[PDB]
């Protein structure tokens, strides 16, 4: 499960371990550095915790600022008009998080 | 040196319209005279600068046979102060002197600009006597006079007044028909060969005026002598001989630089419903709100209904609100008239709202017509609109918009249609009834709308038999208009790149092997699935499911239904 | 008197003027008889000093067409009454004489813009010479050419069908005209073997022909002043004076040149080897540039829309310019650049309508690549943001005229940003700059490209290994790799300048020669690289390569396969 040995060696490694760990029904090398970032849409105060992925032999499955962003609001936003700049000012704050 | 309406090209209703104006109250002067009939003063033409106006006016007034004079606006400007008044009052006591007559005055705003315009006194003064001379009409016989200007705007607003220059043509710009009528007219005198079409070069020629396409007929016979002539001293038989081609038209058309290409185009479009498939709800509303009122006013009189004046579009980017406008307007042959949303935008940072009055006034003057706005949302959107500032809704332009909404008249049947990817941020206060008052939603195109849409598409291209445009638009779901064409274009550009890549091979195999057919004469479908790899989706599901959801909650408070009367 | 061979610096427009003059004047008979109408009027317009009355002169001269002059200033310095006399003389004599021409100096004098003629007398004359034109076509064989700074500068009622309609934008000489020109104000000096005139056009950036005859002058009169006072005792022996390089560095110093403030329109000397790699990028260029220029057919027969533009963003100091005056250079076609500091400027004084200059030029000079090297400057200005959306005056002005131009005209667009996210979205449409095109990091190759083309005017040692230089310099840009090259040549001057010294010292000391360091050496770049830093972070490339990524992966729709 999340955060657990799998039955799939790490390439990446960098864990200890050097298992590979489960995630969104998928296998990835390491575990995220999450961090927390506050969604606001038109009076809408939301808190969500971002789990960023990096060090992926495969190079797909790292963490990308957009996909994510757009994942983020329109599953806590849904269909919301304009969303664009929601989706600008998270991906920003993740950029410059990181 | 005499002219005629078959030397006339270009413009057709406008040429009726001055007929029917000019000619019967010329060629029968008794019958208004009999009659008690106002017949007609001053008919005030204007249009871009070289549609050939001052020829339109002699070829009226020569098929009329009324006494034609003609007065140069710079010539009559040119005399020192005094002489010029006396050019005026002698050239129109010469038009009536061989009554009937027309006087023509070319150029006039050079003599009767803006008022604010004029400095000098001796500006004021001719055109007071300009205005004073105008009003001496009626004492005449059947003077008519005409005058040419670039815009109703462009003169002294004293003119354009009862007595004076109250009756108004826009010859405007040639459309593709005019422009091949004026096509034809020009290469009478010329050696064409059976490779060139006239008909695709005025197709081509977007934007060009009568005089333009003369200088380019002029321009592609010099490309012609050149090739030829610089073979030759000098010989009359390869002139005898000289034939221009298809290539000699394309490389002039390369150096055109027309001079109407900024203006404003309204002409019938050639969109069709076919070009566009599906949508059979939004066929019948749009016929509904502009062919019903137009084809059957009576019944409106009967029942006693107003038309409603006009209807706003919302939905995906790309998804054919353009195109489902000019379909309408084609259904009822009426005249359509785009204004795109950098048009709105530079009108707000400019500060130039009063501009919208000006899109008005034309769509009235070519009315029957659909004003299409393809962007209401651009300014709303400029100042953020979800959020923005802490402004309101309303703006400058539509502001405008609105005044000249509510002061049209629904008898003139001009028909606004408006278009936004973000219906919210609409100002409220234009989906009012008296206003844009029905909402239609255009959604993502179908199966069948998609199959359309490609086959549309490629109406122009080279493509082989066995591609199955059928399959593909069943693959392609939820891709909008935009994708499709994308789609399209990308296949275009490996045929073409294959056929130049293949060409140049063969070059340098007959350069190493110097001892055919066209390699790639069409689209193979292994071009179509090559480009289907790098097809996206413009719109997303969350969009769709945004639109959605504005949808139903307009359609929320419509659960008032199965009434039933006892 | 002067012919095709006193012009030098406009080949292009001469041959145009040619074209466009001789057949008409040369060939009346064929014009007579035939249907079609020949140029009733030329507007040549360039920045003044350019010798347009000399190209008139010339033209009309080698065809024999009797050659008329009238100067704006003189004529408005007539009374009241005696310029339109002297208008209208002039044209009757024009009519009178064999097929004519004529120039008609300064004409802005005569006509400028109405809202600068307040007075009665201008606007009659104004009026007196619309008349005298519109009426050519009684006269015979009667071309009328004109001066003037710019279109926008006389009364727009000249420019118009029947009058003036035809015009030819003279604009700065280039590097070869600047030579053409040199070789003709140079013909009567006696000058030294020393002296390469490749090297003064090469250099006299911003001139025009004025400008070369007085650098030329100066030269000469400071060979003079240094061979003076030998010569205040004697005259004749003044004979044997030969100019030097040194009298025209010299001069070039003391040039105060006029044309610095100017759009230079010519064909760009670059090309892909200063910029190796890319190989993918450039075949989309050239797909976008050169077959749409280079094979017409082929769009026609497969009825394609060429495409408007294109767009490049990536990090900054990659390269982007480079590729553009590239692919500019390889169809030979004209490029025009628009820095970020003009739209800015274009921005801050609400005059976004120069806009509408920048295309009509660019149309001017088609085949034309027209480069905006930053469309973000005026959205960072605001923040990147303030309260208001991404649309703003100036680029809302290129988007109009970007939909209002011809595909015909081969105009094609590029832009580059730093930002690809800030840029207003309404630009990214179909029909528009529709195409992103990342522009990367240069990897080894285009290092070892770029670090040999900065150093190509430089002395360099063999001994120096590139290779190993762009090897070891993984991440740098092209301004980092500049940057190193020029501080490896400011440490050889330093360590030339002080061996100078040091034999002054010599001297001094014991008063009782080779080149100390004659070129570029192994130990300068060693040092040389001592300040050298990636001016883009790992972090940065990251928003770039993860914007490509994420436009690429929305490609999901392959493998779609027929039936």
Known sequence: ?98 | NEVGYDDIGGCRKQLAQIKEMVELPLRHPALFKAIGVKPPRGILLYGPPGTGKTLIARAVANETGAFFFLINGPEIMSKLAGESESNLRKAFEEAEKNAPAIIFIDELDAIAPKREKTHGEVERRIVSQLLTLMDGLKQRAHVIVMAATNRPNSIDPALRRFGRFDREVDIGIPDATGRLEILQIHTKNMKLADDVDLEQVANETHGHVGADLAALCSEAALQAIRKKMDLITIDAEVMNSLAVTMDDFRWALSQSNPSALRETVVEVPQVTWEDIGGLEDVKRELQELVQYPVEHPDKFLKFGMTPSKGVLFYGPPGCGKTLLAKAIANECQANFISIKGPELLTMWFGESEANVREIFDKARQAAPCVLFFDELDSIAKARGGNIGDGGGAADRVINQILTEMDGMSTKKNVFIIGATNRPDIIDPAILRPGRLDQLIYIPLPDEKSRVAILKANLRKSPVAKDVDLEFLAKMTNGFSGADLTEICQRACKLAIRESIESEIRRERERQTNPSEDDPVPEIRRDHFEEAMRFARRSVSDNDIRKYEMFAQTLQQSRGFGSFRFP
């Open chain 1, 1 to 98: 499960l999340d955060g657990d040995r799998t039955n799939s060696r790490s390439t990446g490694g960098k864990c200890g371990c050097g298992f590979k760990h489960f995630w969104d029904g998928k296998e990835y090398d390491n575990l995220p550095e999450a961090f927390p970032i506050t969604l606001e849409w038109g009076g809408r105060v939301v808190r969500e915790t971002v789990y960023w992925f990096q060090y992926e032999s495969d190079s797909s499955l790292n963490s990308n600022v957009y996909d994510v962003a757009m994942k983020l609001v329109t599953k806590h936003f849904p269909g919301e008009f304009g969303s664009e700049i929601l989706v600008q000012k998270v991906v920003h704050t993740i950029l410059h998080q990181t």
